[PDB]
Design an enzyme around this catalytic site. Structure first.
Site, PDB file in Angstrom:
ATOM      1  N   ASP A  77      44.881 -12.441 -17.905  1.00  0.00           N
ATOM      2  CA  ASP A  77      43.739 -11.402 -19.023  1.00  0.00           C
ATOM      3  C   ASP A  77      43.841 -10.579 -19.284  1.00  0.00           C
ATOM      4  O   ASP A  77      44.107  -9.759 -19.040  1.00  0.00           O
ATOM      5  CB  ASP A  77      42.282 -11.617 -17.258  1.00  0.00           C
ATOM      6  CG  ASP A  77      40.832 -11.029 -18.507  1.00  0.00           C
ATOM      7  OD1 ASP A  77      40.406 -11.388 -19.559  1.00  0.00           O
ATOM      8  OD2 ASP A  77      40.937 -10.315 -17.938  1.00  0.00           O
TER       9      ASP A  77
ATOM     10  N   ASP B 188      42.460  -8.091 -22.356  1.00  0.00           N
ATOM     11  CA  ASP B 188      40.799  -7.571 -22.533  1.00  0.00           C
ATOM     12  C   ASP B 188      40.683  -6.772 -24.113  1.00  0.00           C
ATOM     13  O   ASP B 188      42.106  -5.576 -24.000  1.00  0.00           O
ATOM     14  CB  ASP B 188      40.322  -6.966 -21.615  1.00  0.00           C
ATOM     15  CG  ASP B 188      39.527  -8.162 -20.040  1.00  0.00           C
ATOM     16  OD1 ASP B 188      39.936  -9.208 -20.601  1.00  0.00           O
ATOM     17  OD2 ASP B 188      39.254  -7.629 -19.867  1.00  0.00           O
TER      18      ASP B 188
ATOM     19  N   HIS C 154      43.506 -15.286 -23.074  1.00  0.00           N
ATOM     20  CA  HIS C 154      43.826 -16.055 -22.027  1.00  0.00           C
ATOM     21  C   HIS C 154      45.588 -16.515 -21.963  1.00  0.00           C
ATOM     22  O   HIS C 154      45.683 -16.955 -23.006  1.00  0.00           O
ATOM     23  CB  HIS C 154      43.191 -16.446 -21.367  1.00  0.00           C
ATOM     24  CG  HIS C 154      41.668 -16.503 -20.636  1.00  0.00           C
ATOM     25  ND1 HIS C 154      40.513 -17.180 -19.893  1.00  0.00           N
ATOM     26  CD2 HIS C 154      41.499 -15.009 -21.168  1.00  0.00           C
ATOM     27  CE1 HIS C 154      39.866 -15.931 -19.394  1.00  0.00           C
ATOM     28  NE2 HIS C 154      40.177 -15.022 -20.390  1.00  0.00           N
TER      29      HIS C 154
ATOM     30  N   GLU D 128      44.962  -7.880 -16.820  1.00  0.00           N
ATOM     31  CA  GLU D 128      43.529  -8.526 -15.078  1.00  0.00           C
ATOM     32  C   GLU D 128      45.178  -9.879 -14.641  1.00  0.00           C
ATOM     33  O   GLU D 128      44.558 -11.376 -15.947  1.00  0.00           O
ATOM     34  CB  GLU D 128      42.456  -8.795 -15.383  1.00  0.00           C
ATOM     35  CG  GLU D 128      42.018  -9.206 -13.673  1.00  0.00           C
ATOM     36  CD  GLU D 128      40.174  -8.187 -13.638  1.00  0.00           C
ATOM     37  OE1 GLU D 128      39.901  -9.072 -15.130  1.00  0.00           O
ATOM     38  OE2 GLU D 128      39.669  -8.537 -12.708  1.00  0.00           O
TER      39      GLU D 128
HETATM   40  N1  LIG Z   1      31.619 -12.058 -13.396  1.00  0.00           N
HETATM   41  C1  LIG Z   1      31.964 -12.441 -13.195  1.00  0.00           C
HETATM   42  N2  LIG Z   1      33.158 -12.985 -13.844  1.00  0.00           N
HETATM   43  C2  LIG Z   1      34.379 -14.161 -13.177  1.00  0.00           C
HETATM   44  C3  LIG Z   1      34.095 -14.038 -11.310  1.00  0.00           C
HETATM   45  N3  LIG Z   1      35.079 -14.695 -10.683  1.00  0.00           N
HETATM   46  C4  LIG Z   1      36.168 -14.902 -11.885  1.00  0.00           C
HETATM   47  N4  LIG Z   1      35.736 -14.365 -12.730  1.00  0.00           N
HETATM   48  C5  LIG Z   1      36.725 -14.442 -13.894  1.00  0.00           C
HETATM   49  C6  LIG Z   1      35.527 -15.041 -15.598  1.00  0.00           C
HETATM   50  C7  LIG Z   1      36.322 -13.933 -16.303  1.00  0.00           C
HETATM   51  O1  LIG Z   1      37.050 -15.119 -17.454  1.00  0.00           O
HETATM   52  C8  LIG Z   1      37.768 -13.573 -15.779  1.00  0.00           C
HETATM   53  C9  LIG Z   1      37.856 -12.040 -17.021  1.00  0.00           C
HETATM   54  O2  LIG Z   1      36.559 -11.338 -16.960  1.00  0.00           O
HETATM   55  P1  LIG Z   1      36.531 -11.032 -18.209  1.00  0.00           P
HETATM   56  O3  LIG Z   1      35.855  -9.845 -18.016  1.00  0.00           O
HETATM   57  O4  LIG Z   1      37.487 -10.695 -18.981  1.00  0.00           O
HETATM   58  O5  LIG Z   1      35.931 -11.996 -19.215  1.00  0.00           O
HETATM   59  P2  LIG Z   1      36.702 -13.145 -20.044  1.00  0.00           P
HETATM   60  O6  LIG Z   1      38.472 -12.862 -19.721  1.00  0.00           O
HETATM   61  O7  LIG Z   1      36.444 -14.097 -19.959  1.00  0.00           O
HETATM   62  O8  LIG Z   1      36.260 -12.874 -21.678  1.00  0.00           O
HETATM   63  P3  LIG Z   1      35.766 -11.329 -22.416  1.00  0.00           P
HETATM   64  O9  LIG Z   1      37.200 -10.797 -21.881  1.00  0.00           O
HETATM   65  O10 LIG Z   1      35.367 -10.492 -22.071  1.00  0.00           O
HETATM   66  O11 LIG Z   1      36.621 -11.907 -23.934  1.00  0.00           O
HETATM   67  O12 LIG Z   1      37.036 -12.960 -14.452  1.00  0.00           O
HETATM   68  C10 LIG Z   1      33.220 -13.569 -10.906  1.00  0.00           C
HETATM   69  O13 LIG Z   1      32.896 -13.676  -9.470  1.00  0.00           O
HETATM   70  N5  LIG Z   1      31.954 -12.747 -11.764  1.00  0.00           N
HETATM   71 MG   LIG Z   2      38.687 -11.060 -20.041  1.00  0.00          MG
END
Ligand SMILES: Nc1nc2c(ncn2[C@H]2C[C@H](O)[C@@H](COP(=O)(O)OP(=O)(O)OP(=O)(O)O)O2)c(=O)[nH]1
Ligand SMILES: [Mg+2]
Ligand SMILES: [Mg+2]
Length: 280
Positions: A78, A80, A115, A139
């Site tokens: 991950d 960010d 990702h 991450e």
């Molecule tokens: N909110 C949340 N996320 C979780 C959980 N277990 C795993 N995750 C995951 C979903 C996310 O894709 C991943 C990394 O968090 P991120 O803040 O970076 O969101 P993501 O990468 O998906 O999109 P973004 O960074 O905002 O562009 O953690 C949980 O219990 N709650």
């Molecule tokens: Mg992320």
């Protein structure tokens, strides 16, 4: 068009799919078959990709997700806040990581992150999350976690590759009652502080909160410090030197001398706490 991507075809072999929806700035995973909140340990709370696509339109969720398990071969990286306004890499660490880990890459749902999904095994000596002065973060997880899926293939890297992941040691930082039990106890008793607001003597909130910590931690000065560092009252002043001590330790010690009784874990004397709960 998502099922055309070779990496998505690889993930669709597994019945580890969920859907997620934005609550506040969190991304909660949901069972695609019935809409309940989905556990990260209950395989029957997930579905295959077809059930996740169907459940996506049914409950109007934000998108698909994929739960990572120990027995599947996948690793979730991950990145960010590493992209421009037009989605080019603006952090040199992320630029180097992408050069040495060439596997399926996609643009995370906020547009400014990436990702990378790799087949391999993580080094056992690195931290899960690493934060940088830039504001970006790395991450990494191979189980006990889910990943949002977008299909927004980046750089045409659309295939999960089998790569060695020792290189992650150059990017993540290395790593060698119960605290959380006390935190939850204090939260339930209404004794966990809110974040300071405009026109609040933060130093006075520190001391009041430190008094409560003196009680609930049993004047365990090192536990009070571990717990204070996770509170919404933590700030850089906590570790600034002051007269051959830090402001944080002078506060904790003052609280230990101020407070008379202590919470005995084996006596449950929650009624001995001399501080009224934090109003809401
Ligand atoms: N909110 C949340 N996320 C979780 C959980 N277990 C795993 N995750 C995951 C979903 C996310 O894709 C991943 C990394 O968090 P991120 O803040 O970076 O969101 P993501 O990468 O998906 O999109 P973004 O960074 O905002 O562009 O953690 C949980 O219990 N709650
Ligand atoms: Mg992320
Ligand atoms: Mg795995």
């Amino acid at each position: 068009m998502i099922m055309e991507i070779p990496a998505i075809k690889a993930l669709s072999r597994y019945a580890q799919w969920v859907i997620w929806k934005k609550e506040r700035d969190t991304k909660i995973p949901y069972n695609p078959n019935n809409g309940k909140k989905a556990s990260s340990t209950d395989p029957l709370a997930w579905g295959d990709i077809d059930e996740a696509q169907a459940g996506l339109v049914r409950y109007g969720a934000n998108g698909l997700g994929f739960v990572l398990t120990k027995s599947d071969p996948f690793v979730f990286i991950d990145l960010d806040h590493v992209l421009d306004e037009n989605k080019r890499v603006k952090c040199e660490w992320a630029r180097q990581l992408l050069k040495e880990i060439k596997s399926y890459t996609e643009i995370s749902p906020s547009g400014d992150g990436l990702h990378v999904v790799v087949s391999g095994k993580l080094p056992d000596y690195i931290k899960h999350k690493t934060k940088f002065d830039d504001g970006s973060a790395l991450e990494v997880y191979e189980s006990g976690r889910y990943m949002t899926i977008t299909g927004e293939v980046f750089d045409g890297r659309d295939d999960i590759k089998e790569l060695d992941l020792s290189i992650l040691g150059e990017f993540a930082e290395h790593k060698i009652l119960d605290d959380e039990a006390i935190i939850d106890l204090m939260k339930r008793k209404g004794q966990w502080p809110d974040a300071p607001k405009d026109g609040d003597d933060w130093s006075s909130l520190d001391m009041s909160f430190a008094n409560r910590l003196a009680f609930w931690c049993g004047k365990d000065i090192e536990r009070m410090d571990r717990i204070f560092r996770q509170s919404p009252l933590m700030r850089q002043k906590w570790d600034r030197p002051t007269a051959g001590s830090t402001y944080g330790r002078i506060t904790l010690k003052k609280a230990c001398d101020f407070v008379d009784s202590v919470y005995d874990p084996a006596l449950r004397n929650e009624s001995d706490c001399p501080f009224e709960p934090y109003n809401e």
